[PDB]
Scaffold this motif. Structure first.
Motif, PDB file in Angstrom:
ATOM      1  N   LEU A  72       0.856  -1.185   0.000  1.00 35.16           N
ATOM      2  CA  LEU A  72       0.000   0.000   0.000  1.00 35.16           C
ATOM      3  C   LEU A  72       0.890   1.231   0.000  1.00 35.16           C
ATOM      4  CD1 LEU A  72      -2.724   1.440   0.207  1.00 35.16           C
ATOM      5  CD2 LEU A  72      -2.609   1.132   2.691  1.00 35.16           C
TER       6      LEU A  72
ATOM      7  N   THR B 293      -2.654  10.231   2.180  1.00 40.97           N
ATOM      8  CA  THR B 293      -3.984  10.565   2.681  1.00 40.97           C
ATOM      9  C   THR B 293      -3.864  11.800   3.564  1.00 40.97           C
ATOM     10  OG1 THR B 293      -3.978   9.140   4.667  1.00 40.97           O
ATOM     11  CG2 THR B 293      -4.758   8.111   2.583  1.00 40.97           C
TER      12      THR B 293
ATOM     13  N   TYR C 134      -5.527   3.621  10.858  1.00 42.74           N
ATOM     14  CA  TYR C 134      -5.703   3.363   9.435  1.00 42.74           C
ATOM     15  C   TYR C 134      -4.639   2.403   8.911  1.00 42.74           C
ATOM     16  CZ  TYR C 134      -6.234   4.367   4.479  1.00 42.74           C
ATOM     17  OH  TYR C 134      -6.458   4.284   3.120  1.00 42.74           O
TER      18      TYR C 134
ATOM     19  N   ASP D 292      -5.317  -1.079  10.208  1.00 47.40           N
ATOM     20  CA  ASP D 292      -6.471  -1.696   9.568  1.00 47.40           C
ATOM     21  C   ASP D 292      -6.177  -2.132   8.151  1.00 47.40           C
ATOM     22  OD1 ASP D 292      -7.848  -1.134  11.874  1.00 47.40           O
ATOM     23  OD2 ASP D 292      -8.980   0.534  11.035  1.00 47.40           O
ATOM     24  N   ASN D 293      -5.165  -1.542   7.520  1.00 44.40           N
ATOM     25  CA  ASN D 293      -4.774  -1.861   6.161  1.00 44.40           C
ATOM     26  C   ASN D 293      -3.494  -2.686   6.094  1.00 44.40           C
ATOM     27  OD1 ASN D 293      -6.760  -0.497   4.192  1.00 44.40           O
ATOM     28  ND2 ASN D 293      -6.524   0.950   5.871  1.00 44.40           N
TER      29      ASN D 293
END
Length: 56
Positions: free
Chosen positions: A12, A16, A33, A36-37
Motif C-alpha cells: 500500500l 492521505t 488506518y 487496519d490496512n
C-alpha cells in the motif's frame, strides 16, 4: 489543521490527509488506518510540514 500521511508500504503506497485538532489526534487516526490496512512499518512525523510517514 490538515495533517498528511505518506504510506510507503510493501503493498500500500500513496498519500492521505485528515483534519485534526493536533498532531496526537492525527497520529491516532493514521496509526489506526495503517493497522487496519495491514501496514507494519517505521514511522516519522515532521511538525513543520504536518506530515507523518510509515515505511515498510
Amino acid at each position: 489543521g490538515q495533517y498528511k500521511l505518506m504510506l510507503n508500504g510493501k503493498t500500500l503506497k500513496g498519500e492521505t490527509t485528515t483534519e485534526a485538532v493536533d498532531a496526537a489526534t492525527a497520529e491516532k487516526v493514521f496509526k489506526q488506518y495503517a493497522n487496519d490496512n495491514g501496514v507494519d512499518g517505521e514511522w516519522t512525523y515532521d511538525d513543520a510540514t504536518k506530515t507523518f510517514t510509515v515505511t515498510e
